[model samples]
Target chain A: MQIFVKTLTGKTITLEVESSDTIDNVKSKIQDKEGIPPDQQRLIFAGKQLEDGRTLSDYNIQKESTLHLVLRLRGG
Target chain B: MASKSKKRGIVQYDFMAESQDELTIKSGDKVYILDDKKSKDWWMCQLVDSGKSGLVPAQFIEPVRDKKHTE
Candidate 1:
């Protein structure tokens, strides 16, 4: 299964994912693809914030669904 | 110009998505292309203003350079 990941930079990344994959795991995959750490990446689906404990199926993510990636605000 | 460094295009006409796999875009909308060789005349693109990604008609998009000119 794969989902299109949309970023703020107008770049889209296609990620191979499983519905059984957890949010934390998705973040790791995102990190691996974009080189951004899990701590700095927040996955957004259907205008709701996904929890680390929740799985992709929990959110009812379907095929060809686009998941928006939001950067975690880091106050320096 | 054979530059894949910054592949991008701007919408030339209004388009309505026939399915969820496609994206709806009106005239003057800008989109960044990801895969151009996926299908014939139908490429996947991502929006700039809104974070939306899907397949769109490649013919409707006019290619533009990503270079920034301050002149």
Candidate 2:
């Protein structure tokens, strides 16, 4: 399945991965593909997060679905 | 810029939203800042548009410096 990932550069990229993987696995894949750490990445599945082991399936996103990641940073 | 003596010509964008329900336009709505402690739901807002001031919703406002829509 293709997981469409949006990068900080405002580019949209897709990854084909199995839905069986955990949410952490997806985060790791995103970090690998876009050099962004999981700590700094604010993943908005539909418009929320998986504060725990909450499966992506809970959010009803398909394998090739698109998830917009909002870069998190506070005012300096 | 036009002469100081001449009346300034302001531009305005019209966004008409019918009252979905009973909406109250508060006096403080003029400067309602969103997502902040001072933020309030501005059912009505007075903003400088194209140089003229008009009443609009806080949601329809954008920062004067940046064109990005401000919440």
Candidate 3:
């Protein structure tokens, strides 16, 4: 399956991954296309800030799911 | 569990809601923000009068920036 990351760099990128991958690795993959560091990456979906150590399926991330990759200092 | 927002917006224009996931509204209708906003241009809101909810064009409705009052 795939997820979308809305980037601050003026474009969106698709991350192809398995449901078993944690949000940590989701950004680990999000790190590749956007050229952003992992520490500054934060993802939000369905009004909730996705926490680390949870799988994509745990967050119910589905096909073509659009996740906002925000740079944040809140909600670790 | 998360809570629903009390945020309100006034519809600035008319939308017919041709899509299945859209909500129809009038020029001056008031809506409640469902907080299910997906993107910059779209949001899920509830109509005040009819109690119906669906996706709406975010640009078509403006946020209620202030409540005028006296000190």
Candidate 4:
């Protein structure tokens, strides 16, 4: 399955994932690719948290669906 | 140039389940869980990641429309 990801800097990238893959796995991929810290990551979907431990099947997300990757920076 | 006002278009999707899992997205963008308290029709979506789908109402999500520019 192909998952599209958009970064906080308005950068977009596409990757592959299975339906059984959880959001945590996606986080690892993001961190590996972009060096984003795990603690400072928040996958915002329509102004809501996509949450960790969620899979595409769990959330009904398709394999070729597009997702936005927002970087959660520390220091409010 | 006459300062013309414009209306923005919004896109949305929906999912209805008796229960929703607790969410904690790691995306830096803001998100809104548009819950339909009326008929229990709600959606957990990321808001404006591509600079789109921001501040949209959860009620008007019955039908997601095509991207259009309105004046």
- Predicted complexes: DockQ each: 0.03, 0.05, 0.05, 0.06
lDDT tens per residue, model 2, B1-71? 33233222111323332333312232222232222122222222322232323333333344443454355
Model 1 clashing residue pairs (backbone): none
Model 3 vs. true fold: TM: 0.49
Predicted candidate 1 versus true structure: per-residue lDDT over A38-64, tens digit per residue: 766656665445778889989788868
Lowest summed lDDT over 10 consecutive residues: which window, candidate 3 chain A?
A67-76
Q: TM-score of model 1 relative to the true fold?
A: 0.49
Q: Model 3: how far is A62 from its true place, Å?
A: 1.0
Indicate whether candidate 2 or candidate 3 has the larger lDDT: 3
Candidate 1: segments with Cα more than 4 A from true spot: B1-71
User: Model 2, A1-76: lDDT tens per residue?
Assistant: 7888664336687866567665667777877786666665545554344432545676667876766654444211
Off by over 4 Å in 4: A46-48, B1-71
* Model 3 regions lying over 4 Å from their true place: A73-76, B1-71
lDDT of 3 by residue, B1-71 (tens): 26455678887666656556778867788988876354544577788998888876555567676432233
* Colliding residue pairs in candidate 2: A2-A64, B10-B50, B10-B51, B10-B52, B11-B49, B11-B50
Write one digit per residue (lDDT tens) for candidate 4, span A1-76. Answer: 7777766556777867677887888778777877777666666544444667887666677666666665532512
Backbone collisions counted per model: 0, 6, 0, 25
- lDDT values, one for every candidate: 0.70, 0.46, 0.69, 0.50
Candidate 4 chain B: worst-modelled 10 consecutive residues by lDDT: B1-10
